[PDB]
């Protein structure tokens, strides 16, 4: 009431808070399979939900790391004490998350092996995790001094229209190798089926489904059943 902000500036500031929080939390716990965040803002104590893959090391020893993370969040973003609390949730089907798979590819590449072998392994893990299709692109100074790009597409993938806003998900990473950086681009097309959590509802707009009819027997001679 005393301090006031117009609704346009308020919503823009909320988006900026989400963007900076997501970038800091990406930069910090990238080696823990970060894979997104949710904020639940309310005119009281708020919540921030971290959708990690391995939560047992996002939480430190007796939850020390989660405590220092909520401390730095409360000290940077100017929240009053106790008005922010920080949660962690394990993400189901990590093979369907583009951020986690791009980090896994970065881990394999930093460990050092054939780029072919790493991309094949990531791609086949994504397929047997349940995706409709995948596309992995690696670009940069591969074997040789001139940069190339290599894509490892497989399965099914849409590119155009509004369905590719919610029905695939992408991730871009940089890998700081010994000679320049490589670029990692992973796209995963999600299944539709359960209309639940593993994918989206509202299937692809040109997929019609026709229910089958019943037996429809006995059109023969008239009978009447009274009560």
């Amino acid at each position: 009431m005393a301090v006031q902000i117009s609704k346009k500036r308020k919503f823009v500031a909320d988006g900026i808070f989400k963007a900076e929080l997501n970038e800091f939390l990406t930069r910090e716990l990238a080696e823990d399979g970060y894979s997104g965040v949710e904020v639940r803002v309310t005119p009281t104590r708020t919540e921030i939900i971290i959708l990690a893959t391995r939560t047992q090391n996002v939480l430190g020893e007796k939850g020390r790391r989660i405590r220092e993370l909520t401390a730095v969040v409360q000290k940077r973003f100017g929240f009053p004490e106790g008005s922010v609390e920080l949660y962690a949730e394990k993400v189901a089907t990590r093979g369907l998350c583009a951020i986690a798979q791009a980090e896994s590819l970065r881990y394999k590449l930093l460990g050092g092996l054939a780029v072919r072998r790493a991309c094949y392994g990531v791609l086949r893990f994504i397929m047997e995790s349940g995706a409709k299709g995948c596309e992995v692109v690696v670009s940069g100074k591969l074997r040789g001094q001139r940069a190339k790009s290599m894509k490892f597409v497989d399965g099914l993938m849409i590119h155009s229209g509004d369905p590719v806003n919610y029905y695939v998900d992408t991730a871009v990473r940089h890998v700081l190798l010994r000679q320049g950086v490589l670029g990692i681009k992973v796209k995963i097309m999600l299944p539709w089926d359960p209309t639940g959590k593993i994918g989206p509802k509202k299937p692809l707009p040109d997929h019609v489904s026709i229910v089958e009819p019943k037996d429809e027997i006995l059109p023969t001679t008239p009978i009447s059943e009274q009560k």
């Binding site: 500036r9 919503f11 823009v12 500031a13 988006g15 900026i16 989400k18 963007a19 970038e23």
Partner: protein
């Protein structure tokens, strides 16, 4: 150094006042709605800020 002439030129109004809140660059700065991001950083972060290309 010293104290009375180190940062003494006034960084009130103008391009020496304002900088991007992400990269601390001074050029192409969007200050509408109090974004205070440069145009490249805004294009990077616009989708999860809430701005969508819609038409």
């Amino acid at each position: 150094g010293h104290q009375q002439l180190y940062w003494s030129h006034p960084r009130k109004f103008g391009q020496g006042s304002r900088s991007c809140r992400v990269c601390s660059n001074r050029h192409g700065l969007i200050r509408k709605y109090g974004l205070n991001m440069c145009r490249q950083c805004f294009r990077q972060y616009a989708k999860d800020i809430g701005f969508i290309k819609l038409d």
